[PDB]
Amino acid sequence: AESHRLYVKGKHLSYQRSKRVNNPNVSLIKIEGVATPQDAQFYLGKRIAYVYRASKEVRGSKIRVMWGKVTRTHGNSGVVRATFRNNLPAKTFGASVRIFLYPSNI
Amino acid sequence: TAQQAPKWYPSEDVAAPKKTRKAVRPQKLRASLVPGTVLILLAGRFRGKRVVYLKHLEDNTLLVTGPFKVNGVPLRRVNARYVIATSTKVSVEGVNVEKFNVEYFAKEKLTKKEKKEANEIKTERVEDQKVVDKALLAEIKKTPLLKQYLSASFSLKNGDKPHLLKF
Amino acid sequence: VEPVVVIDGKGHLVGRLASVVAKQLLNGQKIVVVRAEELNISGEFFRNKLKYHDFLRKATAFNKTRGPFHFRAPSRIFYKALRGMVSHKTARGKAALERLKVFEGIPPPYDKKKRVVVPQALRVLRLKPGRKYTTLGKLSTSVGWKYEDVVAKLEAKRKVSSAEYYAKKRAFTKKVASANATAAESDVAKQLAALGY
Amino acid sequence: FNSSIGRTAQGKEFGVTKARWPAKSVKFVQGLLQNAAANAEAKGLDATKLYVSHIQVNQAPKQRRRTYRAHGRINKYESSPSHIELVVTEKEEAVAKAAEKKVVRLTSRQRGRIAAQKRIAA
Amino acid sequence: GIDHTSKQHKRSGHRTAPKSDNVYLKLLVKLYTFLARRTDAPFNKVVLKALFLSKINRPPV
Amino acid sequence: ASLPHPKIVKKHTKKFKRHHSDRYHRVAENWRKQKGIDSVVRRRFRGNISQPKIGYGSNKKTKFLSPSGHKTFLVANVKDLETLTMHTKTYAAEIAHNISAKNRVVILARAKALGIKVTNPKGRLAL
RNA sequence: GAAAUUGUUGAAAGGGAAGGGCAUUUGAUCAGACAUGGUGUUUUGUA
RNA sequence: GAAUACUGCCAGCUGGGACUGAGGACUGCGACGUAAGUCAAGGAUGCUGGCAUAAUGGUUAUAUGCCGCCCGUCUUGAAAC
RNA sequence: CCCUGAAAAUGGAUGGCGCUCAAGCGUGUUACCUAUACUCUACCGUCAGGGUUGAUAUGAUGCCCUGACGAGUAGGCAGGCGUGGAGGUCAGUGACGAAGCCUAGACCGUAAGGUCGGGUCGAACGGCCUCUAGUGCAGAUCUUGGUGGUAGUAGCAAAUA
RNA sequence: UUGGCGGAAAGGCCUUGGGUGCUUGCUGGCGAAUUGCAAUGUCAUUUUGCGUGGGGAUAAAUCAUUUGUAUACGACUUAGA
Ligand SMILES: [Mg+2]
Ligand SMILES: [Mg+2]
């Protein structure tokens, strides 16, 4: 067809933070479509990929991926907490990111 | 001397590990996976394609087929955590899937010397595929539009919420 | 969900719209706000004129040129209210603010596009009926904006052209609705009705 | 080293405003340039492709005198001399080409994808 | 935080393993620490503690 | 070829540097504790440099081990090298910096015969 | 033949200082493990 | 004559998610079993894939998010005009 | 509750933007955010309580088991790192290159520090057990010596040319 | 390709005619495997350079000299085949 998307779009909002101290080890993700923790409970444990590009070709590609997963819900509005192998570079606040449907329970 | 000595040397004998208590009970699959279910492949080379599930294998994998005449997916095994069990059900009674096992799919592992600088199929595999898919498509021809459904790919459109969608 | 969101600023409250839009930019949504002369501020016109005069008094004593700049256009008043809510002195704030452009009227890039509203910042949905409000264009031309009438003339011309568009669109959609109704009650129509479409 | 010197129109060639005419420095530098051209023709160079490839100036040891200031004080009056060196070379052709081999590492999935593309197209 | 009712990390204040470097005294305290550990008689513990003592705590008899 | 060990973890892989060693050239970056009465580093304010303490100490099963898994032992000649004959899987030899090349070839030959790992088998070598 | 301080070359950043801490992107640069004993001799210098 | 709400209990069942795997022959307390034995019972094992190299990682420069006032001294109190 | 009463000097502060059935005031119910605090786990150290001379191989100040604890100026104590020189030892290193110096190269230690590779260089130096002291610097309007910014700046204008 | 309309930042919208390709509106035939149980598994647009081969066009500014409607110096205003 014309669409081939097998993931859900999301936005990298910020790190986990207090009013004046942030914590880069936990990122905050807005998954689009979900507006409550009860709907966000479907997406727990799903893999997340941040997909970006670079000028230098490394192993056949100019596209590099950072992997992570959803761990828990955050707040009352469907924001989730996500942890990555290496933390997200904080210039990606507001950048798009992919939530895959695996590991599936359905 | 440059360094004097250590007064005691540590022993070089490696100890044995303790006797473990982790036996292997078999995998308890989720309830939506019954044989004959149409699955959607979430990842892999054939991602977004709808296949039919036949047999639960020994290494917790699912035996699936396209059929190969419909969408070009051969006889294959997939992971149960990388599929979506749709509610669409066909009957796979009349297919002899006990031939396939974990030794049926062997990669014939490659040596470190054989490096592909720049750049085939088992005849047993191809007539096994031809035996099973002609038994599947006879069950496919009963209810309408299943051949078209299995040939078409799955993809998420704008406005599709997977937490609200029923498959 | 959208590449660019075009917001019709008419009938909106300035602070509530700015707090919606600033969070949208910080999340990464591109926003363009049109018809900035029709924003509303709650309160009397005399109260908001006194507020702007209190703001207008404030300037650097030894050199007025480096003081706070008192911008007079309604779009720049909205930009001031929004820059107050974005942390504009950082690179993240600058990158957010470059996803925004605010206009008086609807310019020709956006007069053929779709305008949306924000229902949690609409005056008729937020204020109690009876409370007094202002129009940002009237306040801005009271404090020194020079282009209130040329925007009105351009908006009159644009509305005439848009009504000429809408008459043809309404005639076409009535033809399409007539054909859909006559091509309903067939077998595919009843099967789609059973399946929910 | 240009703070509080005068401004001039002849810096428009170099996009500056502050420029001067250091006659003694020009005399010493052009004497060294003449000597280097003489060394080049003695060595047997082309004498038409020469450009000044290297030049540097750094500080020699100072030469000190005395200055007499009010209320009977002494201060220094020091000359800051120079060490100058320069190298003229012939302007040659393009330098080099034929960079590194850049051996590639591909996974089995990448190799299967490239083989699939090569099969699926011509 | 703990509301401590005592001084944390304090030594017991009783001298063990005597401060002398006499090798025969160290052999004697090795023998008597074996005896005090395993013979379950109070005499061995008493003489083991008396072996640690300094000179002014060992007056002549 | 080393003895099996747990995963080596460094609690603080960054070097502890003296406060204002970046600021002044007279202040070397060898660690000194701030004994000042108003020192923000001594008072442990947020956003300042961290100080060495006993909590950063390495695991006793992991301490003094190279990433290869051995402990470095400095050697000067063949008789010093021969002390690691029965302890090859725990210690690795390192030739001292002041050994000549014609002795270094002898030590490398004897270590290769005895199966001993040398951590610097490239010093003063000519090619 | 050190440092302060300086010249040239190279790399990098720079909207009213610079420098630092935690974390990661990007660029540059770099260490370690990769044999192992092994059924085995498909073997040459026959062990 | 019932139901339901509210509160409380179950040595009732069951689904999803995250972090951790310390220890290293055996010894103990137990459970299921007539027994042999088995086990979730004094701390993780089983199966599989890719790569085997700057890919992970270390160092360093830069960028970004948040934080970070100049040290020493006297002083009740120092970033101190 | 709101309003009058209610006047100060650079321009100005519910923290700012702004907010009017509030994003104000009174009150109630839930959900949610996060401290170096609490719970569980790992690791480091300290303290305490114990086990273990049996043969083989070492270290009994050793090895092992268990539990609790960890802020700190003035100050006290303990264990260590480094320097000049001395007794002993390694029949130590070295003109096939000692010492020193440079090195956004590598390794070890929580740290003081130690080790290696490369460059430069040219004649002595080191590990361990002990002994000894003119033994560790950022400051003292410290001492001696050297060098900056200021800065190609102030200026080089009395006595007729 | 024909005809319009659009100046707020028009740079886009509509329309006439023919060509050409596809059509999943409906019914068929062949292909796909081996990427081995996943690895973004690579499909976008931004700027520049260098080659082709096809058009298009053949300037000024500054220094120096000069002016004094200007001027500390720069700058400004003039003149000069
Ligand atoms: Mg004078
Ligand atoms: Mg320094």
Side-chain angles (χ1 to χ4, degrees), chain C residues 15-16 42 57 59 80-81 84 126 128 131:
Chain C
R16 304 193 170 270
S42 61
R57 288 188 63 246
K80 193 249 182 181
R126 291 302 308 176
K128 192 151 84 173
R131 300 301 182 202

Side-chain angles (χ1 to χ4, degrees), chain F residues 19-60:
Chain F
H19 191 57
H20 288 343
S21 54
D22 62 357
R23 197 177 180 87
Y24 305 104
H25 191 278
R26 61 181 183 258
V27 174
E29 65 183 1
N30 314 326
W31 174 254
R32 300 298 191 260
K33 195 182 183 64
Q34 290 295 129
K35 277 74 70 177
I37 59 175
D38 289 344
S39 186
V40 285
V41 175
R42 189 195 62 80
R43 291 205 265 162
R44 302 198 220 107
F45 275 91
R46 186 193 62 195
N48 285 104
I49 57 167
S50 61
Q51 302 184 301
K53 38 180 68 174
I54 206 57
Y56 288 116
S58 308
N59 198 352
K60 289 190 297 301

Side-chain angles (χ1 to χ4, degrees), chain C residues 159-170:
Chain C
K159 281 180 203 183
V160 165
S161 296
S162 165
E164 271 156 50
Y165 166 69
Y166 177 72
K168 308 180 189 302
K169 187 172 185 171
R170 186 176 51 200

